[PDB]
From a paper:
FMDV, a small non-enveloped RNA virus (genus Aphthovirus, family Picornaviridae), exists as seven antigenically distinct serotypes and many variants and sub-types. Structures of several serotypes determined at near atomic resolution have revealed a capsid composed of 60 copies each of four structural proteins (VP1 to VP4). A prominent feature of this otherwise rather smooth capsid is an exposed flexible loop (∼30 residues) on VP1, termed the GH loop. This loop and the RGD motif embedded within it (residues 145–147 in the O serotype) comprise a major site of neutralization by the host humoral immune response and mediate FMDV binding integrin89101112.
Subsequently, for O1M only, we tested the effect of 2 mM Mn2+. This resulted in more complete decoration of the O1M particles than with Mg2+ and the Mn2+ data were therefore used in further analysis. For each virus the two well-resolved classes corresponded to distinct poses of the integrin, for PanAsia these were termed A and A′ and for O1M, A and B. The integrin portion for these complexes was resolved at 10.8 Å (pose A, 4.9% of sub-particles) and 11.5 Å (pose A′, 4.2% of sub-particles) for PanAsia and at 8.6 Å (pose A, 5.9% of sub-particles) and 12.3 Å (pose B, 6.7% of sub-particles) for O1M (resolution assessment uses the ‘gold standard' protocol). Integrin binding in pose A is very similar for both PanAsia and O1M; superposition of the integrin based on the virus structure shows <8° rotation between the two. In this conformation, the integrin molecule is almost perpendicular to the surface of the virus, as might be expected for initial engagement at the crowded cell surface. At this resolution the cryo-EM density for the integrin does not reveal detailed interactions; however, there is density consistent with the RGD in the FMDV GH loop binding at the interface of the αv and β6 integrin subunits. The D of the RGD appears to coordinate the MIDAS Mg2+ in the PanAsia complex and as expected the structure is similar in the O1M complex with Mn2+. Unexpectedly, in pose A, additional density was observed bridging the integrin to the virus surface (for both PanAsia and O1M). Further, the integrin makes a glycan attachment to the virus in the vicinity of the HS binding site.
Author numbering:
A (entry chain 2): 12 to 218
B (entry chain 4): 15 to 39, 66 to 85
C (entry chain 1): 1 to 208
D (entry chain 3): 1 to 220
E (entry chain A): 1 to 29, 32 to 263, 265 to 503, 506 to 594
The structure:
Amino acid sequence: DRILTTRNGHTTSTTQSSVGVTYGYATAEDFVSGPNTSGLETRVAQAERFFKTHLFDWVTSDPFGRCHLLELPTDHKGVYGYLTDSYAYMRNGWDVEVTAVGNQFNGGCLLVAMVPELCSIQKRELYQLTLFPHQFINPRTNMTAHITVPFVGVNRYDQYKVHKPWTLVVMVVAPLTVNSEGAPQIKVYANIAPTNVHVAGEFPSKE
Amino acid sequence: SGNTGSIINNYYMQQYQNSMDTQLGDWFSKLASSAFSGLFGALLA
Amino acid sequence: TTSAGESADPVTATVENYGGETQVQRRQHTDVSFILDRFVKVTPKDQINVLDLMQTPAHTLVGALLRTATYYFADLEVAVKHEGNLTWVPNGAPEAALDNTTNPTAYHKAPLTRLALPYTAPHRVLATVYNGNSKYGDGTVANVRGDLQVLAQKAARALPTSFNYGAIKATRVTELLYRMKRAETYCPRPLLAIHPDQARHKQKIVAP
Amino acid sequence: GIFPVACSDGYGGLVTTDPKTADPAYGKVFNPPRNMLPGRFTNFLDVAEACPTFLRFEGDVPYVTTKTDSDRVLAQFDLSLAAKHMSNTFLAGLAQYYTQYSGTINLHFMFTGPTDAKARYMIAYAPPGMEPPKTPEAAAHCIHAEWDTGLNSKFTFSIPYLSAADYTYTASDVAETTNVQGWVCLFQITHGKADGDALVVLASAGKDFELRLPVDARTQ
Amino acid sequence: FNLDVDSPAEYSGPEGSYFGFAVDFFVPSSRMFLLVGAPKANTTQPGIVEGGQVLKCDWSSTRRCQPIEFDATGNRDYAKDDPLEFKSHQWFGASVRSKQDKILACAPLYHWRTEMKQEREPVGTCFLQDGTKTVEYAPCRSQDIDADGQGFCQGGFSIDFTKADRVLLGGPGSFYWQGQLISDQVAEIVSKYDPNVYSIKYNNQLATRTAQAIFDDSYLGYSVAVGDFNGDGIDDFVSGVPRAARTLGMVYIYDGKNMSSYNFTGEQMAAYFGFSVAATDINGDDYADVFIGAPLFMDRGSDGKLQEVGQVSVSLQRASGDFQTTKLNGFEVFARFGSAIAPLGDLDQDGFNDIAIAAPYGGEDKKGIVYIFNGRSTGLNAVPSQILEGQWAARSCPPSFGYSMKGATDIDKNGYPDLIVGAFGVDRAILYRARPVITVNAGLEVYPSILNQDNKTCSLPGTALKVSCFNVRFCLKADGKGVLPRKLNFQVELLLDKLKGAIRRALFLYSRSPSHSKNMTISRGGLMQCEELIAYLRDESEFRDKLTPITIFMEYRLDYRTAADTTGLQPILNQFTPANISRQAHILL
Ligand SMILES: *[C@@H]1O[C@H](CO)[C@@H](O[C@@H]2O[C@H](CO)[C@@H](O[C@H]3O[C@H](CO)[C@@H](O)[C@H](O[C@@H]4O[C@H](CO)[C@@H](O)[C@H](O)[C@@H]4O)[C@@H]3O)[C@H](O)[C@H]2NC(C)=O)[C@H](O)[C@H]1NC(C)=O
Ligand SMILES: [Ca+2]
Ligand SMILES: [Ca+2]
Ligand SMILES: [Ca+2]
Ligand SMILES: [Ca+2]
């Protein structure tokens, strides 16, 4: 009764322990045809695929609130990051997918959250990270969390060299409790993908 | 409508009072109304 | 209600699950357009005051409740007690245009002069804390402590100097008050109440 | 002649919350379009009802640890929105700017133990009037509920709103130190090999939770 | 009291080089030397003005002070046209500590460019030399950096060796001046050395970690001392934290095995409690006693006026774990008594260790004073048995005689430990030698002591009349430890009726005189020498005074000139030992 294998473009991602995809803040995209671009935008369909990245190593000595904040977009050394140095104005959503593979005998949990415009946080502020598009990961139930968000922003197209709208945040809510039969150290990976990018305005070539 | 309490019409029209909004061509009320309730298994009385 | 504990879809185990019933609930006092359009005091400078809404304090009601939103749209009307003549200037004009009287001055009428300003920003929606390229941030590194620390706090301040409703300039403003109407908010942020050191934060409530 | 009026006395002062709108000064402004922009909320309770936020326990942590001894009280906190345990919750964030409320408060209980550790718990509501119960035998006579840890690992228990008056104060009294609105107690009844394992708790606004009469907390 | 002041060894250096800012002894394996720190001395290092150097001063024969090359190089580069370090004015030699073949010197104001951005942070550095070996030791020069890290650590501001050959290093600037104690074994300092690695990790390193922000600006590691305090043999870490507890000053003691936390605290604001610390067993109970200095302490006099005199807190270590703290105040106002505290070992070889405390800005013309305090059973004798005076005038910076000093080293093999005093303000360093202590068992017997005026036993040659006589008898016996002559000639003086312009009622028989001297020559450790003679009473009708007791006085003086040895180090007689004794005799009626 379960369709649990996502794909974006020509790359797939099958997980067998998906509790469900959480659509944050919208189920559909905004009007991409703005009046601040005079109709000179175009969709690049070849930017929609996953790209893997490493986040941290959740070990047993990590207390509450060992958070990790990577700003999206990060250094993409493929097709998507070519558009950052070749087009000035661009917009996109994201559909992140973090993996924390241990086994079903570890304990603890780590919250995953896509949060816009995130800087200067407190550890007393971490209590209310649930407000954002979030999805828990505990090894007793699942291994992945699959969050999808649209383009938010102050204005319709963005300059990603001077601005980073989203921030993938993973923090640890309960510490990793290994047992006699669990896994000692788990490593948190993530494959991130854009959704329906739209560039506008060609830079001159660097030559 | 806000924190207005007047039944009379405004004196200044609509565009010397506010800034007019422009269409081009909500969420958490739909999110809080799709909340699951009841139980998960076969209940008794 | 037993649920799927990690899917993060909303679940509301109501009070009917162990007998009983729910009552009709009214939520007018928690509406976002009702709770934000009342006057709040900010501290003024002597003459020139940019009409940014993020200079409202963080302890007051609609300053700590405006920072609940990431993105906000609201028309501002101010109420300022001054002496002299107070010229409002729209968004992005040169600050030498505060002296000119063709800009919408209000002559001194005792005691104070309230006037309704439009949303003059170029952006579709303003924002509470824009972070183009100021914060990383997943764990800022130890940099400045001791004396230098006080100035180091303004390192992370907001940059879209286009996040303002304009500026007002008088001879000496004494107390200028903000309120924001037709307020639309987007993308909520965490809201914090102060930390009790006792079993419960007991303060002296009003009593005859 | 002209239309005679009487400039009435006592009226017309500046009130900070009045429904009088100020006279415009600069018209003909057309905003940039904002329609169907993502993530809009209308009332602050819908954020508080659709998004649960953690609690606070001893050690600045949201989780409560299972207890391998004869004492079976996991947590026992008084029921107010100015409590110590409820302090970091978003629900008590906006209830710091009001005076009185009514309605249910959902508590969400997620168990984060391994697949071989099993336990069962109970949560009871002790209404005010005598001392709160210290054993799960004594707390069986409250409006309680039990659940055990299995496949679905989350439990949501809606705190009933029992009161004499129709609305109860969200600010616990400064001098009066008995907390005569109520206690809520959660225990463990047993656990199988669940030592050192956690139970992260959350709180949300209920289905019929509504606040009333806004004031200014002013970081107090 | 036994220190030589007549002709002490003087050593000098370049003017302005601060010759004497730090001093120590160097005893390798069989010549003896002196180490003087000159942190402002110019070097031949390429393009480095006032790099500072440490000088090995030959005590044997001439007074030559040959500099020691720990580092002859200039500023290494991080990249092309990008200096890695700044050895200019690095104050190398500001702290010098030696143990057998190992000499450790440091540069507290050595600055270092980060391996990232181009900064100039005073992490401080040190150079450890083991005979032919010479490595660099910069524990604060790490990946942890500026202000909140170890960037402003100034590692090497104070240093000390333990008995298990482990280095103790202090840096008052770590973690926003919280300060840091760093301890490494001398094995790994050289074994893990790498000329191409600027931040060396040591596997067995003990260190104080960073603490809460309220501990900032406390200056831990300002001064250091070593001694055992938990009774496990391993030297523990004593350090002054002079700005801790809102400028009240504290002193921390950590375990020398795992850096586990006693804690001392001051009584007065801004008295600089912890400016100097010292650990030595002062009461012979083999329990290391803590000495803490607070040069800025103000005391009240009989006029009830505050006066800055300085204070040292003597904390005796009891087996109970507690301390028996005694406070010792300064003597001159604004002299900053307690700036330097130096264990001397058993200076007089009496059975208890001794200690020296200095008031560098005291004495006439701000020359400087060093006070010598002797230890005993009850603790430290609060009265100084000797007062060492500076002999040099000021130029710009005051002579600072006593600002740094080192003792507890028998450098001349006389059986008695010596003392170095550094006066950097005049670029001088002074070695005081300890003179051999001679204990002397003097004796005096008068028999009979009850004189019968009508006895008339002893006849008197020249007259048919006989006189009432009696016997006087004096004895000498002396012995001493260390190196000293086996023959000892003394000058004994005897006076009859010492109490008396007045008439003396008794005189010696074979001289007819109340005064008699005897050149006596006894042997060290040898038997007691004893010469006796006959004294007689005057005739009854020669004086009326018959009630006043006739006091017999014996006094002796040692020939110091002939007791001198090789260099001319003349022995001295023990303190608290009467140089003269007196017995009396009565007449009846
Ligand atoms: C009168 O005058 C004569 C001459 O001056 C006195 O002669 C003295 O007699 C002393 C007692 O005999 C004598 O003492 C020393 O010699 C003793 C043996 O003759 C000997 O026994 C003593 O040892 C002991 O003596 C000490 C003395 O302090 C006592 O304390 C002990 O208890 C022991 O008895 C002495 O070695 C002394 O040498 C001698 N002196 C002279 C100059 O002849 C005589 O005592 C006088 N008598 C009166 C009237 O007082
Ligand atoms: Ca020890
Ligand atoms: Ca002792
Ligand atoms: Ca001694
Ligand atoms: Ca000697």
